[PDB]
C-alpha cells in the first residue's frame, strides 16, 4: 500500500552496515578477553566482554545518522545512560532460546545465568533479563528492525545528563518513523510489532536501573572495581 | 668469625617465607592475563603482568618486618615510588642469561625486548634494563640476599611523598645490617658483594625514572591508558 522513501531507506542501509561493521557473529575476539572461570570468578571475563561491547556500541552510535552532530556532551550523556541497554539489545543476537543463554562459542564462551552471578549480579537482574531476551527473540525481528530498535534506544531524549533534549527527541522520532513504516511495508504479519517493540524499550529501563544499582554496589568495593576496565569505570561511573 | 643474631635471623626467615608466599616459579597464574600478541599489541598482557606483580609486591611488603606499622600514607608512598623497582628486582628470578629474556613459560610467556616494545616502551629503558638484569644475575645471590635487597629497596626513605623519613631510614638500616652481616658470614667469596648490591639500588633509580617518563607519555594517551588496569593507573598515577 506504500513504500519507504529514499531518505528513510538510506538510513536503513546506514544502520545495517554500521551494525555489520561493529558486530561479529563469530565472536573471535573473545579469546583476547581475560579467560572466564566457573568469589566473583567470571568478573574479569565479563568486564572485558562488556568493555569490548561499549567500544562496539560507540562505533555503531557514531554511524547513526545525526548523532555525530550532537555535542560531545550529549553523545557522552546518551552513550553513558543507554550503553547497558544497547548491549542487552545486541546480545539478543547471541541468545539461544534452546539453552536460555548467550552462546558465543562454548562451552567456554557460553554464558548462563549462573555465570553472570559469578560476576557479581543477582537473579533480581538476570531473571528479568532472560525473560526480556526470550520475549525479544520470539519477535523474530528483521535485521533492519533490530538495528532501528538499537538506534532508537540510544536517542532516547529522556536520559539524565542530556542537554539539547529537543534535537534528540526529533531524531528519535525520525527513526521511529522509518521503523513504523518499514514494519507496515516490509513486515508481513507485523501489525502489533511496533507496539511490542516500543514496549521493549520500557522493559530496558527497568533492566538498566537494576543493573545500575547492582553495579554501584560492586563499584564501591575496591577489590571488585579493580577487576573492571577503565572504560567500564568511565561509562558506568557516577562522574558528572 | 661471627654469626647472625637471633633477631636478624628471624627477619631472614620472614622475608624468605614472604617471598615464597608471593612468588610462583611455575608462573601458572599467567594464563589468566589477557593473552599476549606479537600498535601496542603486548600492552594488554604486560599491563596484566605488572598489575599482578604489584599485588604480589604489596603482599611481600606487608610482611616486611616494620612496614605494617607505618602510616598507610607512607606505605602507599613507598609502594608507589618503589613498585616498579621491586618488580624489576624480582623479575630477575625469571630472566635467562641464555636468551636474554624473562622466561615464564614460552614461547607464549617468554618476554624479549621486542615484546616490551609492543607495549609502548623503548630501548632507552630496555637497554639498561637487560644490562641490569644480566649484571644482577651474575651476582648469583643467595635467596636470602635476594629477598633482603628487595626489602631494602622498598624502605628507601628517599622517596617523593614520604613523611616520617626518619623511621624509614632506620628500618632500611636494620635490614642493610642483616644483609651485610649475612654476606660476611654465609657468603663464601663475597667481600665486595654488598657494595655491588647497593650499587644496583642506584641503577634502579635510573630505570625507575626512565620508566616513569615513558609511562607518563603512554598514560596521557587515552587509547593506551584504556588498556591498563585500575591498580596500575593508581600506583603509577600522578595522583597526589
Amino acid at each position: 500500500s506504500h513504500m519507504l522513501s529514499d531518505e528513510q531507506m538510506q538510513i536503513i542501509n546506514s544502520l545495517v552496515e554500521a551494525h555489520h561493521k561493529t558486530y561479529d557473529d563469530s565472536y573471535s575476539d573473545f579469546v583476547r578477553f581475560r579467560p572466564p572461570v566457573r568469589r566473583l570468578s567470571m568478573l574479569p571475563h565479563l568486564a572485558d566482554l562488556v568493555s569490548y561491547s561499549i567500544q562496539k556500541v560507540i562505533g555503531f552510535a557514531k554511524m547513526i545518522p545525526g548523532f555525530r552532530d550532537l555535542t560531545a556532551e550529549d553523545q557522552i550523556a546518551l552513550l553513558k545512560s543507554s550503553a547497558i541497554e544497547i548491549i542487552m539489545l545486541r546480545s539478543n543476537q547471541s541468545f539461544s532460546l534452546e539453552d536460555m543463554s548467550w552462546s558465543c562459542g562454548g562451552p567456554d564462551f557460553k554464558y548462563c545465568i549462573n555465570d553472570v552471578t559469578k560476576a557479581g549480579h543477582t537473579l533480581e537482574l538476570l531473571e528479568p533479563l532472560v525473560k526480556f531476551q526470550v520475549g525479544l527473540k520470539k519477535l523474530k525481528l528483521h535485521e533492519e528492525e533490530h538495528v532501528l530498535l538499537m538506534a532508537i534506544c540510544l536517542l532516547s531524549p529522556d536520559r539524565p545528563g542530556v542537554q539539547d533534549h529537543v534535537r534528540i527527541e526529533a531524531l528519535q522520532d525520525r527513526l521511529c518513523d522509518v521503523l513504523q513504516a518499514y514494519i507496515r511495508i516490509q513486515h508481513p504479519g507485523g501489525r502489533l510489532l511496533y507496539a511490542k517493540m516500543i514496549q521493549k524499550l520500557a522493559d530496558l529501563r527497568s533492566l538498566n536501573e537494576e543493573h545500575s544499582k547492582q553495579y554501584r554496589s560492586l563499584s564501591f568495593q575496591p577489590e571488585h572495581s579493580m577487576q573492571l576496565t577503565p572504560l567500564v569505570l568511565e561509562v558506568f561511573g557516577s562522574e558528572v | 668469625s661471627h654469626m647472625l643474631s637471633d633477631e636478624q635471623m628471624q627477619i631472614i626467615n620472614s622475608l624468605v617465607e614472604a617471598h615464597h608466599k608471593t612468588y610462583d616459579d611455575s608462573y601458572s597464574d599467567f594464563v589468566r592475563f589477557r593473552p599476549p600478541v606479537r600498535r601496542l599489541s603486548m600492552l594488554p598482557h604486560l599491563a596484566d603482568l605488572v598489575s599482578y606483580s604489584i599485588q604480589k609486591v604489596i603482599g611481600f611488603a606487608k610482611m616486611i618486618p616494620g612496614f605494617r606499622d607505618l602510616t598507610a600514607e607512607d606505605q602507599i608512598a613507598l609502594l608507589k615510588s618503589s613498585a616498579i623497582e621491586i618488580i624489576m628486582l624480582r623479575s630477575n628470578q625469571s630472566f635467562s642469561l641464555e636468551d636474554m629474556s624473562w622466561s615464564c613459560g614460552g614461547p607464549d610467556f617468554k618476554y624479549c625486548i621486542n615484546d616490551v616494545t609492543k607495549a609502548g616502551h623503548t630501548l632507552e629503558l630496555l637497554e639498561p634494563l637487560v644490562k641490569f638484569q644480566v649484571g644482577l644475575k651474575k651476582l648469583k645471590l643467595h635467596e636470602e640476599e635476594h629477598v633482603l635487597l628487595m626489602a631494602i629497596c622498598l624502605l628507601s626513605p628517599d622517596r617523593p611523598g614520604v613523611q616520617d623519613h626518619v623511621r624509614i631510614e632506620a628500618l632500611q638500616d636494620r635490614l642493610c645490617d642483616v644483609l651485610q652481616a649475612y654476606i660476611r658470614i654465609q657468603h663464601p667469596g663475597g667481600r665486595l658483594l654488598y657494595a655491588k648490591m647497593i650499587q644496583k639500588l642506584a641503577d634502579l633509580r635510573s630505570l625507575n625514572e626512565e620508566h616513569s617518563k615513558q609511562y607518563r607519555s603512554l598514560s596521557f594517551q587515552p587509547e593506551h591508558s584504556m588498556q591498563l588496569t585500575p591498580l596500575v593507573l593508581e600506583v603509577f598515577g600522578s595522583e597526589v
Binding site: Q55, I58, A61, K62, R68, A72, Q75, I76, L79, K80, P230, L231, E234, V235, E239 | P222, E223, S225, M226
Partner: peptide, 11 residues
Amino acid sequence: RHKILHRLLQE
C-alpha cells in the same frame, strides 16, 4: 572527565 569516551567519539 570522560577522557576515554571523548577519545573514542573522536574521528
